Structures are given as C-alpha cells and as structure tokens.
Write a protein that binds this DNA or RNA. Structure first.
Length: 427
DNA sequence: TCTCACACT
DNA sequence: AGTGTGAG
C-alpha cells in the first residue's frame, strides 16, 4: 500500500505580505505594530494585513481600524493606494512578481495567491542528493527549521527546543539511502532555507514555509511555526499531528464540507477519520470527496503542483454597501467605466509582460437584498483592450436586470460590480 | 460596509 | 455557460 511519500512539496507564505511591502518602502514602520487598511473614511478603514507586533495586541484582519486602535493605541497604519475611486493593489502585485521570479530559479512553482506559492522540490532534491555523495547534513544548513513532533522522549526556551528537535531528527537520519522519504524531505528543507535566504537577500522580505510530501501537509506545516520559520512535517509525524488537529484546519475543510464531516460523522479531529471505510466516506460526501478524505486523514494527497506562475484571470471589482448602492443608470455606467479602465491598464501590462491576450469578459453584479457573493454572472467577447467598449459591453449584458420601469434609475440597487478577463490565449 | 481557483451541473 | 464553494 502506497504511503504518499513520492514527492517533496513546499508551501511558502510571505509573512503579512502587504505590511512587509509598506515596511520596506517606509523604514519608520519596520518592527512596529502596523497594519494595512483600505478606505480610511469608514471607521478608519478595513484592515487587510497585520504585522506580528500588532497581532500580539489582538489586531486581526477584517477589523475596522478604529476598533484595532482600541486594542493597540500606537498601531501604525498604511493605506492601500486608491485609483479611479477604488483600491489599487498594483504595488503588492508587483512585489509578488519579484518574489515569484526568485523562487522559480530554485524549482517549479504554483502561484496560489498574491503572497503564497507551492513549490515542487522533487527534482531539485534528487540532483542535490547526487552532489552529496554521502555526506551528513549539518544542523548548520537548517538554521530556521522545525521538525514537527520533535523533540520527544527522555530546555525552557523556544530556540533550544527547535535545535534539540533538529538534532534528534538529524541524529537518526539514514543518509546512505538516497530514496528514504525522510532524507528527501530533509534535503528539501535545505533547499527551502536557501530559497528563503535568497528571497530575503534580494527583496528584503521574510517568509515562512512548510515542507512535506503534498500540498495539504505543506500548507498545514507552514502555519505551525510563524513568522520567518519553516517546518518539516514527515509522513511519520502525521498520526500524532492529526490526533488533535481540528478538521477545519485542513485545506478545503474550513467551510461547509468540513462542517458536514464533523456533524455527520460525529468527530472533531482529522485522525478520527481513519475509522471509516472509503465506501463509508464516499456515501456521505460523494465519490471524489470520500476518496480524498480517506487518503488525506492518512497523510496522503496527490494534487499536483501545477507549473503556473501567472494568474489565470485578471479581475476588478468593488462593493457598494448600504446607502452607497448604485441606484441610477448613469451611476452604474460610470463605475463600469472605472473598473474597465483599471482592467485595461492591467490587461495591456499583461500582454506586454507575458505574451498572452484575454478573450472573454465576465460581468458579475449583486443586487441589494440578495444573500450571496454574486447575484448574476454573464459573459461576452473581449475583442479589444479598450475601456469604453468593455464598459459598454458589460452594461449591455446586464442592462436587463434593471426591474425599474424608468430609464433613468436602477432598481434594485447594485451592491457589487465585477469585471474579469478570462480565457487567455498565446499572443 | 478585493480578489483568485475549482468542481458541479 | 452560470452557480456555489474555499481561500488569501
């Protein structure tokens, strides 16, 4: 029976990335409690990223800055740039490309979000193991690495625990066997240390990483020791790790499916899933989900690191909540035009940088009173990178959702506009 | 009180 | 194509 030990996969996460970008640019912010906000006018702005000094006071994302200032009176704030009446994330997108370009010198990367990427290290590990002839791996090559589950068995401070765990790991490693999964993970950790050092040297940015045999465990590992640290989760560490791991902590189980796993099966922790047969899990959750859960609770997952450094879609959206919901036709057209102009700028940039053209334009709106993220999605052809045509076309394919008899007004009022360019072709 | 990927149908 | 879900 296969053990899910065929690959070495990392997940790298830029520690509070937007904050780090503003702290690099403004040295006054470095090593302070600070947060990044957008839209300062309403309750001081919505916090979207928080430094670890500020998290110590209890400041979190999705907090209003006025409320964060009550927890942390000396909190320093940086504001997202605004363009055409909306938040503009270009500075962070550009910083993200800086980091991804460095990472891709070391291995194959899948961009997961603006601040996270998965790394497939299997091949880089192989070549490094050949160059190693048969030498032991010194703890000096792993200065920021934690081994999950260690130390164990027969020091009062955190760095002492880290090194004792590392020593126990390395003292047991079988270095003559170039196919040992634990050795391959270890070499993977050595490479991630070098990649993280290169990112910090060449950009100033720090990051955490998880190293394991698949994306779910790497992502889990990454969050175990933060910030500016990396954690190795071996296959052998999974039973103990999962024995007290809430189901909602595993990637894709933090929502409704995870809640139904908990309620239907009457369990709380990932390891308790091992009691069920694969057929049992498939009967409750479907063929795909059931098979996935059966393997995943044993630490096995086969989702590939896709070779994808660039986003698949380029989108622009703005919410219009409460009294600001768009209620007149000229209001709707003006904002469509604003969104189309930012989209055009980014699409032209994309065509010149990455040699591709988008071919489909997706329009999505939300009407006041609706319950879900999007009320309605329609698409049309994207034939020219021209903001006025894109906004005209977006309006055309949604102008019929207007329930009002009057030409002049829009009912029900629109609480969200969304333009997204999709279906990219080589150019 | 902004994005991005993926599976179902 | 259009919708729902999960995540940062």
């Amino acid at each position: 029976m296969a053990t899910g030990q065929d690959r070495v996969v990392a997940l790298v996460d830029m520690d509070c990335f937007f904050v780090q970008v503003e702290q690099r640019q403004n040295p006054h912010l470095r090593n302070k409690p600070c947060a990044v906000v957008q839209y300062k006018s309403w309750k001081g702005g919505g916090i979207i990223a928080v430094s670890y000094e500020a998290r110590a006071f209890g400041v979190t994302r999705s907090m209003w800055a006025d409320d964060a200032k009550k927890l942390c009176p000396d909190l320093l704030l940086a504001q997202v740039r605004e363009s055409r009446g909306k938040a503009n994330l270009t500075k962070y997108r550009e910083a993200s490309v800086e980091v991804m370009e460095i990472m891709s010198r070391f291995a194959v990367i899948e961009r997961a979000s603006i601040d996270e990427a998965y790394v497939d290290l299997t091949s880089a590990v192989q070549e490094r193991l050949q160059k190693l002839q048969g030498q032991p791996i010194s703890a000096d090559l792993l200065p920021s690495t934690y081994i999950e589950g260690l130390p164990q068995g027969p020091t009062v401070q955190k760095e002492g625990m880290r090194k004792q765990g590392l020593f126990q790991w390395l003292d047991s490693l079988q270095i003559d066997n170039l196919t040992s999964p634990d050795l391959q993970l270890t070499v993977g950790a050595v490479i991630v240390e070098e990649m993280r050092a290169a990112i910090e040297r060449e950009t100033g940015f720090q990051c955490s990483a998880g190293i394991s045999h698949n994306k779910v465990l790497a992502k889990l590992a990454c969050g175990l020791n933060k910030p500016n640290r990396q954690t190795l989760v071996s296959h052998g560490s999974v039973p103990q790790l999962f024995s007290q791991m809430p189901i909602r902590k595993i990637r894709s189980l933090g929502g409704k499916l995870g809640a139904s796993v908990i309620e239907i099966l009457g369990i709380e922790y990932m390891g308790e899933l091992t009691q069920f047969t694969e057929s049992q899990l498939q009967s409750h959750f479907g063929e795909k989900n059931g098979s996935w859960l059966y393997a995943m609770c044993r630490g096995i997952e086969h989702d590939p690191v896709k070779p994808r450094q660039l986003p698949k879609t380029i989108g622009c959206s703005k919410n219009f909540p409460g009294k600001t919901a768009l209620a007149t036709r000229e209001q709707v057209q003006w904002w469509l035009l604003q969104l189309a102009q930012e989209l055009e700028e980014r699409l032209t940039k994309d065509r010149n940088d990455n040699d591709r053209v988008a071919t489909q334009l997706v329009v999505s709106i939300r009407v006041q009173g609706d319950k879900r993220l999007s009320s309605l999605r329609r698409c049309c052809a994207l034939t020219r990178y021209d903001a006025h045509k894109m906004s005209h076309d977006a309006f055309t394919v949604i102008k019929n959702c207007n329930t009002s008899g009057i030409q002049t007004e829009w009912s029900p009022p629109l609480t969200m506009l969304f333009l997204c360019a999709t279906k990219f072709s080589a150019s």
